[PDB]
Amino acid sequence: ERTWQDERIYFIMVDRFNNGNPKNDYEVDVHDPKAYHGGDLQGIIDKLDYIKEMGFTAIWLTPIFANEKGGYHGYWIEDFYKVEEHFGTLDDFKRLVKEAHKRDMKVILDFVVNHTGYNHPWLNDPAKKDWFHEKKDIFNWANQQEVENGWLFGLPDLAQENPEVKTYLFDVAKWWIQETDIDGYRLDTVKHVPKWFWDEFAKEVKSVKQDFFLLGEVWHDDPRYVAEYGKHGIDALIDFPFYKEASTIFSNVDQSLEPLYNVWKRNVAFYERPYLLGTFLDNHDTVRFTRLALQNRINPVTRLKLGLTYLFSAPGIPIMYYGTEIALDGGEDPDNRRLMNFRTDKELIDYVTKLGELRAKLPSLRRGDFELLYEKDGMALFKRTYEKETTVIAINNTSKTQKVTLDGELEQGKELRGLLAGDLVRSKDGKYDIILDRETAEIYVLAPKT
Ligand SMILES: OC[C@H]1O[C@H](O[C@H]2[C@H](O)[C@@H](O)[C@@H](O)O[C@@H]2CO)[C@H](O)[C@@H](O)[C@@H]1O
Ligand SMILES: [Ca+2]
Ligand SMILES: [Ca+2]
Ligand SMILES: [Ca+2]
Ligand SMILES: [Ca+2]
């Protein structure tokens, strides 16, 4: 049966994906990095087959609720019960969900509880003074209550301690679920909101949809800090510790993969559900992984193939930011949120398709254990086993041809059939000699000798 461990997520910033209706292009200006660029819900529906053909099983949309001026990204909300006018209507969104569901795809909406836009009407309502915390900047970030009570980036910080605010938020959470039949929320700014709140929130949204999925963004690289939030009703967490290592290691050649395995081991140590961690090479808040490769003066296509190979073969829930599949460039926010281009070379689109198909086909890649057999200076072998399937993931992140011999770590008398690139390694006297040319990868299934 399908579980969230089995899912692959395609992550989209609505305004920056596909402008499928030019008639809602209000003040659009593609040459202003802080304007709306036109991407909308019709654009998303038009590309669902594109997304599915890459092997993606779910989509995550940045927030669709009406924003104030300047809020192209969706995080400066003006009305919690309205679809943003640039993106479409409520009916256009219900059709998106129906069309995703027709293709067996899940829909995750980005959901904000922490704050409103700078100019939300509530700020003028004398009866709403107590809906917001005192207007203060966050200074001591080691003070968790200051982090929870301060105005993040000057954004009006909602007071969940007020039961009217809490009820409003639960009410709206439940409404979108009941009205549009979405499958989950990606929860923004989870660490700026107190833990007791998430326990109650979780209980509310699953009371209306038993299997409703929550993915928490807890922006921190310490897994002990992040994992505490999984005890408060949030199913899955964004893996910033994975990201930190994967972005760095795969953006240049001749770098050790071992820190990624320690990320795993630490995930098993600290989290209740270590397969339910969202893994990624970049996102809408980081520099593009392509930019990291460019900065290192090295071919980004090659870097992405190795990184994506790891992403689609390691534990977790892969989350691929729109544009990864065309090596879309971009520096810091807002330059990491460039309009998508659908008319490029297809090399990475096809590669990603292969990887998504292999992750779907090979249950060891979704549910297997995860063992490190060998790692030296970027040359890595991993093993995964699920029931009677054994897979070996070989990533040569070195600038040399590498030969590694396994002798004991695999059952003798068999062969490793390469499913990514067609390699074949037969057991010779109980040994498997694995050869990979520089900056290549292969995913092998252990099978009878042919
Ligand atoms: O105006 C400040 C800031 O707000 C938004 O940032 C988001 C971020 O994208 C989320 O993933 C998360 O960390 O919460 C933030 C606040 O909701 C905009 O995305 C950003 O461009 C802007 O500077
Ligand atoms: Ca449009
Ligand atoms: Ca608006
Ligand atoms: Ca807060
Ligand atoms: Ca080693």
The DSSP secondary structure of 48-62, one letter per residue, reads: HHHHHHTT--EEEEP
Closest ligand 1 atom, CA of 73? 19
Residue partners of 450: CB distance under 8 A and separation at least 6:
415
* 281 closest CA partner among 235, 322, 340: 322
The helix or strand, by DSSP H or E, that contains position 301, with its residue range, turns out to be helix 300-313
- Same domain for 299 and 154: yes
Q: What is the CATH number of the domain that holds 403?
A: 2.60.40.1180
Among 320, 340, 363, where does a domain finish? 363
Ion ligand 2: residues, Cβ under 5 Å? 19, 21, 24-25, 38, 40
Q: How far is CA 97 from CA 10, 41, 48, 160, in A?
A: 15, 10, 11, 30
| Ligand 1 site-directed mutation target among 11, 73, 138, 240, most atoms within 8 Å of CB | 73
As for how many domains the chain has, the answer is: 2
Cis peptide before 334 (omega within 30 of 0): yes
Residue 249, SS3 per DSSP: helix
- Same domain for 419 and 336: no
C-alpha span between 327 and 106 (Å, rounded): 25
Resolution reading in Å: 1.9
* 233 closest CA partner among 132, 113, 318: 113
- Same domain for 340 and 449: no
Structure tokens of 394? Answer: 């070989």
Domain that holds residue 419: 364-450
Residue partners of 84: CB distance under 8 A and separation at least 6:
64, 65, 66, 67, 71, 74
Q: How was this structure determined?
A: X-ray
- Same domain for 307 and 382: no
Q: Distance from the CA of 272 to the center of ligand 5, in angstroms?
A: 28
Q: Distance from the CA of 271 to the center of ligand 5, in angstroms?
A: 26
- Same domain for 370 and 355: no
Q: Whose Cα sits closest to atom 13 in ligand 1? A: 189
CA of 21, nearest ligand number: 2
Using a 6 Å CB cutoff, which residues line ligand 1? 73, 75, 112, 153, 188-189, 217, 219, 284-285, 333
| Ligand 1 site-directed mutation target among 14, 153, 155, most atoms within 8 Å of CB | 153
Among 363, 380, 399, where does a domain finish? 363
- Same domain for 434 and 290: no
* 55 closest CA partner among 237, 318, 391, 300: 318
- Same domain for 346 and 377: no
- Same domain for 326 and 393: no
On whether the CB atoms of residues 400 and 438 are closer than 8 A, the answer is: yes
* 176 closest CA partner among 115, 111, 243, 121: 111
- Same domain for 307 and 359: yes
- Same domain for 63 and 143: yes
C-alpha span between 310 and 314 (Å, rounded): 6
Residue partners of 376: CB distance under 8 A and separation at least 6:
256
What's the residue count for the chain?
Answer: 450
Q: What is the CATH number of the domain that holds 218?
A: 3.20.20.80
Among 309, 342, 363, where does a domain finish? 363
Structure tokens of 90? Answer: 């409520």
> Under the phi-then-psi rule, with left for phi > 0, alpha for psi from -120 to 50, and beta for the rest, what region is 379?
beta
Residue partners of 188: CB distance under 8 A and separation at least 6:
63, 75, 110, 111, 112, 113, 114, 217
